Amino acid sequence: AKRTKKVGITGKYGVRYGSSLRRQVKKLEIQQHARYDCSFCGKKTVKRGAAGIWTCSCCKKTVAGGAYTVSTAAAATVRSTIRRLREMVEA
Amino acid sequence: AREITDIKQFLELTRRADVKTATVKINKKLNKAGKPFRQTKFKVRGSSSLYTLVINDAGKAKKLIQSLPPTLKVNRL
Amino acid sequence: GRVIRNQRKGAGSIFTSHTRLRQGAAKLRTLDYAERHGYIRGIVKQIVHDSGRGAPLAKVVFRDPYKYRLREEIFIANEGVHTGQFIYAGKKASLNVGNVLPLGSVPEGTIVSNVEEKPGDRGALARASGNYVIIIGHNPDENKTRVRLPSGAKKVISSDARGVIGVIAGGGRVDKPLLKAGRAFHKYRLKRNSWPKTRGVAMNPVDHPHGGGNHQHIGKASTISRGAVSGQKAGLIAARRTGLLR
Amino acid sequence: AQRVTFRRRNPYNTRSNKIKVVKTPGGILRAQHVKKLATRPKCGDCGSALQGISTLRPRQYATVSKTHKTVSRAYGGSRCANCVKERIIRAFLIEEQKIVKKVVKEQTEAAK
Amino acid sequence: AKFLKAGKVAVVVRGRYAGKKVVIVKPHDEGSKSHPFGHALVAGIERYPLKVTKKHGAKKVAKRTKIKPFIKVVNYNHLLPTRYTLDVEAFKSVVSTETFEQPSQREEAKKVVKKAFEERHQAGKNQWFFSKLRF
Amino acid sequence: MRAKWRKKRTRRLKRKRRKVRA
RNA sequence: UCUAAGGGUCGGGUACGAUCAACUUAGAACUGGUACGGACAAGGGGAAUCUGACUGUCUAAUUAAAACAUAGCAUUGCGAUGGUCAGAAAGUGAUGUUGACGCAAU
RNA sequence: CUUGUGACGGCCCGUGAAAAUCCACAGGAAGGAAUAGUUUUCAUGCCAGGUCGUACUGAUAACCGCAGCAGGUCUCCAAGG
RNA sequence: GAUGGGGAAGCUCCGUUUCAAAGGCCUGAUUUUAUGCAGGCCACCAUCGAAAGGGAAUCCGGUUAAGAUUCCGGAACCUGGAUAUGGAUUCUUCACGGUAACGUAACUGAAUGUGGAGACGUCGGCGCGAGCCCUGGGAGGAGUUAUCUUUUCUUCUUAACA
Ligand SMILES: [Mg+2]
Ligand SMILES: [Mg+2]
Ligand SMILES: [Mg+2]
Ligand SMILES: [Zn+2]
Ligand SMILES: [Zn+2]
Known about the structure:
The structure is cut from a larger assembly and holds chains A (about 90 residues), B (about 80 residues), C (about 250 residues), D (about 110 residues), E (about 140 residues) and F (about 20 residues).
Chain C: H1 5-8, H2 34-37, E1 39-49, E2 56-63, E3 70-76, E4 86-90, E5 111-113, E6 133-139, E7 144-148, E8 154-158, E9 164-165, H3 181-188, E10 223-224, E11 236-237
Parallel strand pairs in C: 10-11
Antiparallel strand pairs in C: 1-2, 1-4, 2-3, 5-6, 5-9, 6-7, 7-8
Chain E: E1 8-12, E2 21-23, E3 27-28, E4 39-47, H1 59-64, E5 68-75, E6 79-85, H2 103-122, H3 127-130
Antiparallel strand pairs in E: 1-2, 1-6, 2-4, 3-4, 4-5
Chain F: H1 3-21
One magnesium ion (MG) binds near residues 52 and 70 of chain D.
Chain C binds 3 RNA strands through helix 1, helix 3, strand 10 and strand 11.
């Protein structure tokens, strides 16, 4: 059964700390504790070890990523513009 | 502190030129509920190990008893 | 009056940084001959967590070109570097994330990190998690490059300074609320003894300029001159303006 | 329901002060200090435990023979079998890659 | 087409002779009773000959040009076939399926395989086969 | 060990070859 | 004084039977000077106001609080030839095994 | 019940010592047999292991509180209902 | 916390690898011989700092008025050094077997390099082991017994090391 209506993983915090702070903490802990797709072995086995460290349980690779998600949007647009500049530098 | 399970290796062990002392132990053992037999243990004192040979037959046991060398100081108990 | 707390911090008795569980200074590889005439290839062996630091570190192994042995450098890990990745350091290195190109050989709009100020100090700029340096322009004659720093400042440094291409991993950390004095305790427990902070207005006048009074109030203005002396600089030092702008 | 005591002068429950209660041939209970357990040797590449290698404290490896410390392969007591296999594969394949790369790069500039 | 022929050279990837170069003299695609898998009857070098320079005069040369061979049945999954090849005529008749399970016959086959490998090595033949795969 | 052990090994071999020299 | 439910291990050509061992729950009669968590052990509760968000801390030996701290919010300084602080001086130091998602001051 | 351990799982903006010491691998320097050697990581056999502490209490009487002071002072073992 | 250095009128202060010409390591070669000269290798760079951290190796029984993992009897183990015999290996000189994971009594390996162990949080549940607790039969001893109780209590143990 759905035990909580809206608090989810922040149900461990009780009534403390304020609802709007618990909302942000919920949104970041879901990303923090979710599993992700491994870009090398192709499985849903990537988990966070520490802040910025994302290791795959199957193929034992370890990728440096964001603090609570495996890849941040800033890193995505940086990787895109590095790829674009690398194609431009021969042209 | 070692078990020896071979008669000829026991004989070549008893003449190892560091062996001085042996002890022959008689025990009353019960292999089954109806058969009290006698067990003999031949304990040879080497320089770093005590070697025990366990014989469950009295004829073989006494045959080893005359097979012991005469220079070996034996203890009957 | 007494000697105040920020005045006492400089003796370094109990205010030294707690460095027991740290894995070494995260510096770039030294600029010997290979890095300024060609490149060199190393390997990422492991990405590890550094105590008291928000970003992960990378243990990169190179071969010593002059002796049969292996050198192990500690890099600050860029976001996207994985274990087993080949890292290329040098003047002729290709422009990929993790490579250690000098700033004279990258085009406009490149995002780098762990940037040397002068060529050879092995990393000074944009080293905290999520920070980066953008190359704003080149100047071949009187060979300098303009860069945009994480503070928004624009520096003009040498084009022989090196930088690791990409952004520092572990970004977005400070967006999560700590929620707890225990969490702040465990955060500063591995950095240094600067927490908790007693307000100086809650002290006695022997202990702080702000202390004393029958109500908790500052008294004089809290903006302090730059020419003030030690024991006076408690407040907003050399503030050009104050208040919340809209 | 006998109760035991430490047999050494350390009265604290440290990691090197672990005891186990045994029953002596005198019929009494007595503490017996046990040494710390050994961890298995690990592979240099994959980091998993090496199979076929004895597990001892590091000074005890000087007492056992070579058979207890090695396997009968190249990188025997040092790397895992699959790690040795994949580095053999990697070695042969990329020396072949270097041969093909060398002949193509000489051929293109010999033509031009 | 199939390539695992009776003259190929491969690299063993498993067992006591891992990383050693062997020459296949007898393939068996549909296995046997004692070996129910696709296997071969390879012969190879256990101890490679060492490097020879101008400084060694004939005594160190005879010392360093020794080859210790072996004969072995290996699964196809434990072999890595290569692009090179090696001629077999001198010992394909003396290593076979019944020359195993008999240590005297293994000794006698290893002697003539050693003689063939030393004459091919003292001739300028198969430098890749007689070199050591360094890994 | 391995260092004092190799030194003891070479000492034993050196002593043995010195006495079989005679 | 009873009833019911909750198991293990052996046994089947190419549905069950035997044996063994657990304290858990529910129910029913009967009974007593209506007693039965029989000693021990063991929450008083509700309606509101003021105040501090909470957990935490302090005046050892008259004040434990509404005081302090706290997370949250905001301001200030600083790109290393630097900010803040130390030292009688120094080829001297702390932050700094640091670099603005940082350090320092409120 | 106490304790040891194994495989796991949760937590972290906390990911939770160092060195002495020991072993293995890669490498192939050098030494090597045939009437003989080479090996003491196999077995057996020989000799030696110095210096200082070691009793007892550890607390309503062996410590500290002017004392044989209801105070203070770290820890291990732990039967039946 | 010395040294090299640099301050300080100075008692002394800074600093601990620094603006230092900072040393020792094995093979041997020589057998006037002592240990120089043949060589070759290596660059940390004092030292102090834990009777709870790391760490070579010992257990049982007995014994005193008072000591014991220390004494006695028995049985082990480690380190350092001497060394011979057996076994192993070799005329294919430096082992064989198994497809393999790997196995064995052994089964050369200098310089140099690499790897492992040392070497590691806390909590929760589950599995296994040891000791204790509970309990049945049997062999002994003691207790209660007007009545009742095949009953109540107690002994029945196995160390290190191989
Ligand atoms: Mg503090
Ligand atoms: Mg005031
Ligand atoms: Mg083995
Ligand atoms: Zn994967
Ligand atoms: Zn492996």
